[PDB]
Design a protein around this ligand. Structure first.
Ligand SMILES: [NH3+]Cc1ccccc1
Ligand SMILES: [Ca+2]
Length: 223
């Protein structure tokens, strides 16, 4: 996250870190046994880390649970990043409390102008590299589809939305991928892609979760 603020420990209780020896992507806890992330975060050998603030220090609220199954969306296209969504089942259920909690799925799609919260452990610089150890947060609005398509001609599908600031300065970045965009207490987006971080006229692009609720619910019910 570029241009954000330190969230505070366990203030984003649905945020997870995906770990393969190191943090590589975010995700969101949607019930005691399932996480949703980006398909472009797929790899084998995922450990899900819940209850994290500092990802390099054991602070006492962590739960570390290995994945038993990963399910990339049937129509994910790695060239265009259309359908950039994946489900991860945990080998055992997490223990839910105030500091480790699920986030609700949306019943309706959020409109442009809605303010959302984006969070992650990704790069904090637009030029160069500095990775934080504690969770960073950013408040940002959903942009109109017309502004999003104007920023990225030929690249925005109905399964994507833009959020952020056309003036630049504040954005998600590498290492935030897979993490949550929460608006009005519901999971509306997944950090997906963009051109660089925090550049003028190049806002972040997010997977539009409201288009996937039926797939999520049916997949969880049968796996
Ligand atoms: N600035 C949006 C973004 C770029 C690369 C990875 C994740 C997010
Ligand atoms: Ca920790």
């Amino acid at each position: 996250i570029v241009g954000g603020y330190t969230c505070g420990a366990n203030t984003v209780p649905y945020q997870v870190s995906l770990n393969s020896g190191y943090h590589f992507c975010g995700g969101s806890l949607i019930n005691s046994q399932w996480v949703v992330s980006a398909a472009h975060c797929y790899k084998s050998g995922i450990q899900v880390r819940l209850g994290e603030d500092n990802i390099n220090v054991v602070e006492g609220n962590e739960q570390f649970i290995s994945a038993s199954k990963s399910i990339v969306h049937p129509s994910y296209n790695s060239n265009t990043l259309n359908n950039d969504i994946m489900l991860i089942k945990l080998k055992s259920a997490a223990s839910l409390n105030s500091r480790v909690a699920s986030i609700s799925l949306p019943t309706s799609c959020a409109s442009a102008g809605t303010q959302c919260l984006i969070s992650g452990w990704g790069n904090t610089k637009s030029s160069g590299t500095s990775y934080p150890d504690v969770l960073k947060c950013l408040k940002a609005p959903i942009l109109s589809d017309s502004s999003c398509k104007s920023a990225y001609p030929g690249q925005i599908t109905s399964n994507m939305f833009c959020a952020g600031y056309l003036e630049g300065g504040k954005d998600s970045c590498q290492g935030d991928s897979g993490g949550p965009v929460v608006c009005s207490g519901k999971l509306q987006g997944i950090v997906s892609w963009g051109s660089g971080c925090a550049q003028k006229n190049k806002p972040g692009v997010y997977t539009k979760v409201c288009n996937y609720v039926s797939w999520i619910k049916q997949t969880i019910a049968s796996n």
